[PDB]
Amino acid sequence: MPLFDLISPKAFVKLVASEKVHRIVPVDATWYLPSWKLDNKVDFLTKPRIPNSIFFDIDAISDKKSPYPHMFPTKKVFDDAMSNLGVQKDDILVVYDRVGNFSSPRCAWTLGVMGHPKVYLLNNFNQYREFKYPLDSSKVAAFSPYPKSHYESSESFQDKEIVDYEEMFQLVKSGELAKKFNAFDARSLGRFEGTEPEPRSDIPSGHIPGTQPLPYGSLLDPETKTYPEAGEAIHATLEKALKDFHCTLDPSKPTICSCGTGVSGVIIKTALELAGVPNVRLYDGSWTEWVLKSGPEWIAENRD
* Alpha-carbon gap, residue 216 to 208, rounded angstroms: 16
**Number of residues assigned to the chain:** 304
Question: Is the omega angle on the peptide bond into residue 124 within 30 degrees of 0, that is, cis?
Answer: yes
* Alpha-carbon gap, residue 291 to 294, rounded angstroms: 5
Residues 6 or more apart whose CB falls under 8 angstroms from that of 249 comprise: 182, 184, 238, 242, 255, 272, 277
Question: Residue ranges of the domains in the chain?
Answer: 1-156, 157-304
Three-class DSSP category at 84: helix
Q: Are domains 1-156 and 157-304 of this chain identical in fold?
A: yes
Question: CB burial class (10 A; 0-12, 13-18, 19+) of residue 17?
Answer: exposed
DSSP state at residue 226: P
* Alpha-carbon gap, residue 294 to 268, rounded angstroms: 23
Cα R_g (the chain), whole angstroms: 18
Can you list the alpha helix ranges (DSSP code H) found in the chain?
A: 9-18, 40-46, 75-84, 104-113, 125-130, 158-161, 165-173, 177-180, 189-193, 232-244, 263-274, 286-294
* Alpha-carbon gap, residue 276 to 204, rounded angstroms: 33
Phi-psi region of 277 (alpha: psi -120 to 50; beta: other; left: phi over 0): beta
Question: CB burial class (10 A; 0-12, 13-18, 19+) of residue 13?
Answer: middle
Closest CA to 19 of 51, 64, 57: 51
Question: For residues 19 and 52, is the Cβ–Cβ distance under 8 A?
Answer: no
Closest CA to 116 of 25, 9, 230, 229: 25
Q: How many CB atoms lie within 10 A of CB 148?
A: 13
* Alpha-carbon gap, residue 177 to 300, rounded angstroms: 13
CATH 3.20.20.450 fits 1-156, yes or no: no
Name residue 58's amino acid: I
- Active-site residue, 259 included: yes
* Alpha-carbon gap, residue 24 to 90, rounded angstroms: 9
* Residue range 157-304, CATH number: 3.40.250.10
* Alpha-carbon gap, residue 20 to 35, rounded angstroms: 42
* Alpha-carbon gap, residue 10 to 60, rounded angstroms: 30
Q: At what angle do helices 232-244 and 263-274 cross, to 10 degrees?
A: 130
Three-class DSSP category at 301: coil
The angle subtended at Cα 268 by Cα 154 and Cα 208, nearest 5°, is 100
Q: Cα torsion for 279, 32, 70, 296, to the nearest 10°? A: 90
CA 246 to the chain's CA centroid: 23
Closest CA to 283 of 169, 195, 199, 178: 169
- Please state the three-class secondary structure of 137-205 as a single string: CCCCCCCCCCCCCCCCCCCCCHHHHEECHHHHHHHHHCCCHHHHCEEEECCCHHHHHCCCCCCCCCCCC
Sheet with 211-213: list strands edge to edge.
162-163, 280-283, 255-258, 182-185, 211-213
Catalytic residue selected from 107, 247, 257, 259: 259
* Alpha-carbon gap, residue 99 to 286, rounded angstroms: 21
Three-class DSSP category at 91: coil
Three-class DSSP category at 282: strand
Q: How many CB atoms lie within 10 A of CB 163?
A: 28
